[PDB]
């Protein structure tokens, strides 16, 4: 069964601050029988990236193993590879974007070996949405159907493009890989087109890793930061976006940040609103406020 008879409404919250940023987050199981979301929130990365921050939401499916592994190691795989480093001083925008892509493919490969030797009924997968923030840029990262959104100058400034099986580029890859999109799902089952894990959808002979039925390749969009106008970023899984629009959620959060500076509370309000609107899925939201976010 996919659903409980009564929703599990308990919320897990976390918050922190540093590098001029403040964040809050909320996680809730809701009407689902299992809780398969995971998240990463870190201010200050190692080895010379102390001024950098990384936030991410992982929406797992068919188990929580891939999501949990991603939340514990995706950041390392991203920053430790040669592409991210780009042997010189600090990584260029291109280094960061290539490093993120290499991170996704490498953690996926690594996870494939470990799910092979220790065989079992853990054929899970997880989408990922997040932001790697540097002193000069915000790097939106998307792999799946969760979504990240940036509010700048009281407006929706950017939001990621959900990876749906029926979108043209996805359907193209799926058909080239010998699959099909039926009832909006890859081969009629998985309603996800990009994700880490889901190795059963990655065994197509003659096709590279980014050409499989399900792809681990992330979409990375760099945004030069604006100390004056950047207000906040919302990262949330489709349990939130399925029931609230970009403009609506942005306006809701911007309004709440005029009443309170409690980011966990604002995240709880977002989650509860979506639950009351009828969302029957797991829900995870991270709210990262910049120095010039709406103030209470």
């Amino acid at each position: 069964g996919a659903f409980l008879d009564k929703p599990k409404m308990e919320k897990h919250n976390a918050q922190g601050q540093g590098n001029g940023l403040r964040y809050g987050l909320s996680s809730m199981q809701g009407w689902r029988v299992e809780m398969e979301d995971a998240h990463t929130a870190v201010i200050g990365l190692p080895s010379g990236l102390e001024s950098w921050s990384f936030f991410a939401v992982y929406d797992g499916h068919a188990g929580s193993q891939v999501a949990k592994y991603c939340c514990e190691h995706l950041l390392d795989h991203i920053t430790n590879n040669q592409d991210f480093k780009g042997s010189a001083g600090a990584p260029s925008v291109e280094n960061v974007k290539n490093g993120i892509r290499t991170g996704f493919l490498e953690i996926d490969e690594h996870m494939r070996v470990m799910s092979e030797k220790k065989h079992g009924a853990d054929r899970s997968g997880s989408t990922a949405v997040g932001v790697l923030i540097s002193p000069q840029h915000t790097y939106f990262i998307n792999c799946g159907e969760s979504r990240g959104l940036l509010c700048r100058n009281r407006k929706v400034h950017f939001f990621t493009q959900d990876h749906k099986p029926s979108n043209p580029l996805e359907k193209e890859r799926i058909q080239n890989a010998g699959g099909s999109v039926m009832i909006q799902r890859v081969n009629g089952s998985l309603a996800v087109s990009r994700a880490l894990g889901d190795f059963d959808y990655k065994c197509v002979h003659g096709k590279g890793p980014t050409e499989q039925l399900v792809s681990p390749e992330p979409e990375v969009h760099d945004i030069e930061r604006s100390e004056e106008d950047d207000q906040f970023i919302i990262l949330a899984c489709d349990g939130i976006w399925d029931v609230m629009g970009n403009e609506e959620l942005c306006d809701f959060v911007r309004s709440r940040l005029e009443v309170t500076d409690d980011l966990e509370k604002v995240c709880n309000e977002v989650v509860d609103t979506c639950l009351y609107k009828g969302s029957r899925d797991n829900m995870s939201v991270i709210l990262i406020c910049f120095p010039n976010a709406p103030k209470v």
Binding site: A2, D59, A62, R185, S189, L190, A191, V192, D281
Partner: peptide
Amino acid sequence: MSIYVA
């Protein structure tokens, strides 16, 4: 949902 269809 991701796998459950209904």
